Swiss-Prot record:
Protein's UniProt name: Cyclin-dependent kinase 2
Keyword Cell division: yes
Induction comment: Induced transiently by TGFB1 at an early phase of TGFB1-mediated apoptosis.
Positions with a binding annotation for ATP: 10-18, 33, 77-79, 82, 125-128, 141
Active site: 123
Gene3D superfamilies in alphabetical order: Phosphorylase Kinase, domain 1 (3.30.200.20), Transferase(Phosphotransferase) domain 1 (1.10.510.10)
Cellular component, GO, one term: cyclin A2-CDK2 complex
Organism of provenance: Homo sapiens (Human)
Modified residues (N-acetylmethionine): 1
Effect on the protein of changing residue 156 to A: Abolishes activity
Description of how the protein assembles with itself and partners: Found in a complex with CABLES1, CCNA1 and CCNE1. Interacts with CABLES1. Interacts with UHRF2. Part of a complex consisting of UHRF2, CDK2 and CCNE1. Interacts with the Speedy/Ringo proteins SPDYA and SPDYC. Interaction with SPDYA promotes kinase activation via a conformation change that alleviates obstruction of the substrate-binding cleft by the T-loop. Found in a complex with both SPDYA and CDKN1B/KIP1. Binds to RB1 and CDK7.
Length: 294
């Protein structure tokens, strides 16, 4: 883009490539996301504007959309680090619980806001969560698989993480609900705590079976309707649920109780972002400042 000097390529998206870029007029530093070119739907750019009018301290601001010359550019505010990088950097000592807690609380606020506005993320993962020096965390790179839609790639030969995908998606449900984002955020919370991915599947079925081995193979008792879902097979192995205290030690009982509710199989039993904010886990929540090396 001639309006912009690329400083660097800071991420490889689901949709496209993200660049750190400077505006030659304003001198403002931004994140620039470029999307691959068929006639490049009209319908898409409509509901991108739905993302543009979202303003919340926990949602990364979308500054502009630019359709010119058969690529789509999304201009976003720039943040200095992503949670994936921060977790890797914190792997030795772990992220302090008060900071984990503030981050979870803020992400739930962000989700509560998005969801009350009928916007789903669908894509949540540590790479998509951005932090700053003042202790804020923000939802970014909304994946919307309507308002556009879903490829199997981003641009070139990049491998999509299934680790955060809700079981209803894996079982082939056509219609997502807001519950899919709470699932992903639950997986992220566990990972901050234990410093290991909770469900690191290497394929769709391995992802499913990893969830089953830990939470038990779902049945009609815990998840009415499950056996009727498009990708469900009666031939799935039957695993018993693991004791939950094995899962995220040493998280306290308030944390485990909240996590267990974010991880319910039935999208209808799964806690809402709004209700999650009222959980006793957050009674002592504060806003600590992260030690960030930029
Ligand atoms: C392994 C961790 N990371 C993945 C490659 C490596 C490092 N990458 C980083 O730290 C990083 C930084 C410093 N900014 C972003 C991305 C965005 C940003 O700032 N505003 C946005 C608005 C929308 C959006 F969709 C992405 C961004 C990343 C991934």
């Amino acid at each position: 883009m001639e309006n912009f000097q690329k400083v660097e390529k800071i991420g490889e998206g689901t949709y496209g490539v993200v660049y750190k870029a400077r505006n030659k007029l304003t001198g403002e530093v931004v994140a620039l996301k470029k999307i691959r070119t068929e006639g490049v739907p009209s319908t898409a750019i409509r509901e991108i504007s739905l993302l543009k009018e979202l303003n919340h301290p926990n949602i990364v601001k979308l500054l502009d959309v630019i359709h010119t010359e058969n690529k789509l550019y999304l201009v976003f505010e720039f943040l200095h680090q992503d949670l994936k990088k921060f977790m890797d950097a914190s792997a030795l000592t772990g992220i302090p619980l008060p900071l984990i807690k503030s981050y979870l609380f803020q992400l739930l606020q962000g989700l509560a806001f998005c969801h009350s506005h009928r916007v789903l993320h669908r894509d949540l993962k540590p790479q998509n969560l951005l932090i700053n020096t003042e202790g804020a965390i923000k939802l970014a790179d909304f994946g919307l698989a309507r308002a556009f839609g879903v490829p199997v790639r981003t641009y070139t030969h990049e491998v999509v993480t299934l680790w955060y995908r809700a079981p209803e998606i894996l079982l082939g449900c056509k219609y997502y609900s807001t519950a899919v984002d709470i699932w992903s955020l639950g997986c992220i919370f566990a990972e901050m705590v234990t410093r290991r991915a909770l469900f690191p599947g290497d394929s769709e079925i391995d992802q499913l079976f990893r969830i089953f081995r830990t939470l038990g193979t779902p049945d009609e008792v815990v998840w009415p309707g499950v056996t009727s879902m498009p990708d469900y097979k009666p031939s799935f192995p039957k695993w018993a649920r693991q004791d939950f205290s094995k899962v995220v030690p040493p998280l306290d009982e308030d944390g485990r109780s909240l996590l267990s509710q974010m991880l319910h199989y039935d999208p209808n039993k799964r806690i809402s972002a709004k209700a999650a904010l009222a959980h006793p886990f957050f009674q002592d929540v504060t806003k600590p400042v992260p030690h960030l090396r930029l």
